[PDB]
Structures are given as structure tokens and as C-alpha cells.
Amino acid sequence: MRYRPFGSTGVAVSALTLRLADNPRLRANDWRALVFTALENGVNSFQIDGDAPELLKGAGEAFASVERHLLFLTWRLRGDAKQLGPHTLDALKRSAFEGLSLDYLDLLLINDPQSASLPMAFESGLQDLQKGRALRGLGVASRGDIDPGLLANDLVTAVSSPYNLSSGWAERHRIRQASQNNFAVIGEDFWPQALREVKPSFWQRRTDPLADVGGYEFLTNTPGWSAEDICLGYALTEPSLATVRVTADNRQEIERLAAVVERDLPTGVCAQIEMARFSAQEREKAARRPKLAAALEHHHH
Ligand SMILES: Nc1nc2c(ncn2[C@@H]2O[C@@H]3COP(=O)(O)O[C@H]4[C@@H](O)[C@H](n5cnc6c(=O)[nH]c(N)nc65)O[C@@H]4COP(=O)(O)O[C@H]3[C@H]2O)c(=O)[nH]1
Numbered sequence: 001m002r003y004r005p006f007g008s009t010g011v012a013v014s015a016l017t018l019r020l021a022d023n024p025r026l027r028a029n030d031w032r033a034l035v036f037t038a039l040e041n042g043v044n045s046f047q048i049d050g051d052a053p054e055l056l057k058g059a060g061e062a063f064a065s066v067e068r069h070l071l072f073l074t075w076r077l078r079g080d081a082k083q084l085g086p087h088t089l090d091a092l093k094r095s096a097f098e099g100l101s102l103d104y105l106d107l108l109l110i111n112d113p114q115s116a117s118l119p120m121a122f123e124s125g126l127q128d129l130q131k132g133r134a135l136r137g138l139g140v141a142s143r144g145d146i147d148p149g150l151l152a153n154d155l156v157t158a159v160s161s162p163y164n165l166s167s168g169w170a171e172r173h174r175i176r177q178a179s180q181n182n183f184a185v186i187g188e189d190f191w192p193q194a195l196r197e198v199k200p201s202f203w204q205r206r207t208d209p210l211a212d213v214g215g216y217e218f219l220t221n222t223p224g225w226s227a228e229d230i231c232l233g234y235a236l237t238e239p240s241l242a243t244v245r246v247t248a249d250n251r252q253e254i255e256r257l258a259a260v261v262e263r264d265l266p267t268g269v270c271a272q273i274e275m276a277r278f279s280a281q282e283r284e285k286a287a288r289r290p291k292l293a294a295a296l297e298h299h300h301h
């Protein structure tokens with residue numbers, strides 16, 4: 001395992017962050033062994049995305065096996081961020097603090113509320129948790145530009161965004177810009193939907209309709225490497241990411257994901273990523289209108 005500053009904290013996080021999310025086929029002992037295997041492969045950053053009693057017991061026990069200060073524990077909190085309130089903080093005392101046997105969270109990661117502001121009562125409660133040294137930072141998950149009024153909030157120390165070799169320019173730039181302004185950046189979706197083929201399949205993300213995937217055929221035809229392993233290896237070279245989020249269900253999946261950290265991308269790949277992005281942007285150019293006359297016609301409905 002390699003480690004990286006979770007910037008401006010002096011806390012080092014593993015380049016892999018293991019996500020634990022509800023899974024009814026696992027018991028306490030399985031979650032416990034899942035985290036023991038992570039811990040043995042040098043993973044020290046976890047994101048709990050779930051409140052199944054089985055998961056909190058098992059994760060709880062395994063975290064206890066080592067000293068709290070060696071761990072970076074993020075609690076993922078979903079839902080319309082505009083409807084968070086005291087009920088949220090109650091749920092959080094029960095699940096995240098009592099459930100996991102913790103007296104601080106390194107990070108609480110909420111959804112982008114698409115607003116400069118968080119609800120009064122919730123922000124007050126976070127301020128209280130921080131005064132009590134129970135919450136080191138608030139993080140925001142986004143697929144777009146977070147309101148600068150929110151980023152300027154003293155509470156907000158981190159952002160979570162998808163980054164993968166499908167990622168546009170606008171994305172690549174948002175996360176370097178964030179990281180150069182001393183926000184930690186967690187990388188999501190290293191192995192995105194667009195780059196899997198040989199069912200149903202949802203496409204409800206505002207970034208989805210605009211998405212080239214021509215040129216990634218080398219993902220399949222690289223001797224000694226799976227497409228998943230290349231996509232991850234690539235995310236691990238982006239210097240603006242504090243860490244890359246991964247999800248894994250069994251020991252050998254953890255071990256294989258850890259292996260990728262210490263292997264380097266195959267020899268020709270960086271070159272081919274350029275070939276594919278240079279074709280991506282010859283197509284976005286060759287399929288563009290004059291940006292004035294376009295916008296000006298659009299105005300005149
Ligand atoms: N382009 C695209 N890909 C899609 C879409 N829906 C699912 N995928 C792909 O399928 C994975 C798992 O989807 P899931 O089962 O909902 O699993 C998701 C879901 O349970 C949750 N999640 C992620 N984003 C959102 C979100 O905006 N809202 C909600 N409510 N849950 C989300 O986190 C899990 C992991 O997200 P990922 O790690 O990215 O992994 C996602 C992503 O790779 C979509 O509309 N567009």
C-alpha cells in the first residue's frame with residue numbers, strides 16, 4: 001500500500017479507500033474478516049455507506065483491532081441535503097458513533113445540496129460535533145461545480161467526484177482546481193458503466209448524455225491485465241486524488257485491488273489514453289456550432 005496526505009490534515013490515507021455498503025448475504029464475522037483483510041493489506045481508509053446492524057457490529061469490531069488514530073473513517077450520508085436536520089444527527093449518534101464504537105468521525109460525506117447553504121439546524125449540529133472533536137471535516141459529493149459559498153464554509157474540507165479515463169476535461173480540471181485550493185478529493189467510479197460491455201442499465205446522471213467512449217478497445221487487449229485493473233491503475237496516477245474509492249465483497253477481491261497499487265500501468269497505455277482523448281475532442285470540435293449564433297437563436301424562444 002502507498003499513502004497520501006488527506007490535504008491540510010496531517011492524516012495519511014491509503015490510496016485505496018474501502019467502501020462498506022449493506023449486503024444481506026454477509027454476517028458480522030464476514031464484515032469483520034473483510035476489514036481484517038483490508039487492514040492486513042495496509043488499507044486504513046474506510047467509507048461506511050450503510051447502517052445494517054450486522055455491518056456496524058462487524059466493522060466496529062475490526063476497527064477496534066487497531067488504534068483509532070491509524071484509521072480514516074468516513075460516514076456517507078445520502079438524501080436530499082436540503083432536508084437534513086436534528087433527526088439526522090440522532091441517526092448519526094446511533095449508527096456512526098454507538099454502532100461503530102467511535103467518538104469521532106474523520107469525515108461526514110453528504111450530497112451536494114446545489115445551494116451555497118445547508119439547513120440552519122443541521123449546520124448548528126455539525127458545529128457542535130466539531131466543538132466536541134467528534135467530526136474533523138464535512139465533505140461534499142458532486143458530479144458538477146459546487147457552489148463556491150459552500151466550499152468557503154469552514155466545515156467543508158473535502159469533495160468526492162467520479163474520476164476515470166472516461167472523465168471529460170471539465171471534470172479533470174474541477175478536481176485539480178479543488179486539490180490546488182487544499183480540498184481533499186476522493187475518487188469515485190474508477191470502473192464506470194460506459195466502459196463495460198461483454199441488460200437494463202440506467203443513465204440518469206446529468207454528465208451522461210455528453211460522453212465519448214470510442215478508443216478504449218485496448219482495455220480488453222492488454223496482456224496480463226483486466227479492464228478493471230487498468231482503469232484503477234490509471235485512477236491511481238491522478239495526482240489530485242487523495243484516495244480512490246473501491247467496493248469489494250471477499251478477501252481475494254481486496255488482495256487483487258491492493259496488488260494494483262504496487263504494479264505500474266503497462267508500457268503503451270498512457271500513449272493510447274492520449275490517442276483516445278485526441279479523438280474525443282476532434283469529434284466534440286467537428287460536432288459544434290458557433291457558440292454565439294447558437295445561444296442567440298436559443299434566446300428568441
Ligand atoms: N453513468 C452512470 N453509471 C451509473 C448510473 N447508475 C449506476 N451506474 C453505475 O453502476 C454502479 C452501481 O450503481 P448502483 O447499484 O446504484 O450503486 C450506486 C448507488 O447505490 C450509489 N449512488 C451513486 N451515485 C448515486 C446518486 O447520485 N444517487 C443515489 N441515490 N445513489 C447513488 O452508490 C453506488 C455506487 O456508485 P458508483 O460507485 O458510481 O457505481 C455505479 C456506476 O458505475 C447512472 O445513472 N449513470
Ligand SMILES: Nc1nc2c(ncn2[C@@H]2O[C@@H]3COP(=O)(O)O[C@H]4[C@@H](O)[C@H](n5cnc6c(=O)[nH]c(N)nc65)O[C@@H]4COP(=O)(O)O[C@H]3[C@H]2O)c(=O)[nH]1
Binds near residue numbers: 111141142144206
Ligand atoms: N441509484 C443510483 N442513482 C443514481 C446514480 N447516478 C445517478 N443517480 C440518480 O440520478 C440523479 C441525478 O444524478 P447526478 O445527475 O449525478 O446528480 C447528483 C450528483 O451531482 C450528486 N450526487 C449524489 N450522490 C452522489 C454520489 O454518490 N457521488 C457524487 N459524486 N455525486 C453524487 O447529487 C446529485 C443528485 O443526487 P440524487 O438526488 O441522488 O439524484 C441522482 C440519482 O437519483 C447511481 O449510480 N445510482
Ligand SMILES: [Mg+2]
Binds near residue numbers: 151152154155157
Ligand atoms: Mg472550506
